[PDB]
Amino acid sequence: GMQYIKIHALDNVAVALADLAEGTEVSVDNQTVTLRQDVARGHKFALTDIAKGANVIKYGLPIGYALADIAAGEHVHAHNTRTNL
Amino acid sequence: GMQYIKIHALDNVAVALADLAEGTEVSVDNQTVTLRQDVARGHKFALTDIAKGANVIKYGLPIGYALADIAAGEHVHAHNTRTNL
């Protein structure tokens, strides 16, 4: 099966579908993303840089914002984002 | 776009993509259901009954479990499920 799902075309995060190790390369939307941390199954990782204060877009919706600068390929979770739904 | 997304074929929840009113009839992945509470954009609702203790399945993964019996078309959130990812 797929290692990740990118739920919606506008999303700047994808969800890991397996426990993915730091340094793993993923092919998403005709580009490559390299994980910068371990990302547990079900957790988000960044498809692009998400600057501090910038929206996390998931399901095509702004679901929250970054609490600090997040780099493409980093683990996105409670530590570095706030969810606003 | 749609008013909801069922992300994976195994999921027993869908994600509202707009603020859906109590009463709305939903059709997805050949499945129908009628909403029993308002469901805010970005929030989950049950596609089928989910018994107390039973997994919430989202992204094709077990992401958590029900704290109480959940009826098809109910709002699924912190009040009636726990997330274990």
Side-chain angles (χ1 to χ4, degrees):
Chain A
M2 10 237 318
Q3 298 175 287
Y4 73 85
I5 186 162
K6 184 184 174 190
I7 298 158
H8 187 289
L10 306 165
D11 287 354
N12 59 8
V13 296
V15 177
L17 300 179
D19 299 336
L20 300 179
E22 188 179 345
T24 307
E25 283 184 326
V26 174
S27 174
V28 41
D29 203 48
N30 254 2
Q31 325 192 314
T32 295
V33 176
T34 297
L35 300 188
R36 295 178 63 141
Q37 283 105 35
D38 294 351
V39 181
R41 71 195 76 180
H43 288 218
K44 291 171 293 267
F45 63 95
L47 296 176
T48 65
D49 292 359
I50 307 178
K52 180 178 178 180
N55 288 136
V56 171
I57 306 297
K58 192 175 175 199
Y59 328 108
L61 292 170
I63 69 155
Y65 63 84
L67 293 171
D69 298 322
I70 302 171
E74 289 194 302
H75 178 211
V76 176
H77 205 64
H79 64 286
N80 57 1
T81 64
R82 201 180 82 168
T83 300
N84 272 353
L85 292 170
Chain B
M2 288 268 85
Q3 294 284 285
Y4 33 90
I5 180 151
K6 183 190 177 174
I7 296 162
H8 192 282
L10 290 167
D11 293 351
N12 57 5
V13 301
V15 180
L17 298 178
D19 302 328
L20 306 181
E22 168 179 330
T24 312
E25 282 158 55
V26 166
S27 305
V28 74
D29 185 20
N30 288 334
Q31 307 169 268
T32 148
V33 91
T34 292
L35 297 186
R36 297 176 67 128
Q37 281 100 45
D38 293 343
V39 182
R41 77 192 74 178
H43 288 220
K44 294 173 294 257
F45 61 93
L47 290 173
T48 189
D49 285 351
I50 305 178
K52 181 168 165 169
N55 283 320
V56 174
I57 306 296
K58 185 192 191 176
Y59 325 109
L61 296 165
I63 67 154
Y65 62 86
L67 299 173
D69 287 345
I70 301 175
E74 290 196 302
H75 185 206
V76 170
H77 208 55
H79 63 295
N80 60 359
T81 67
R82 195 222 225 166
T83 291
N84 275 334
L85 291 176

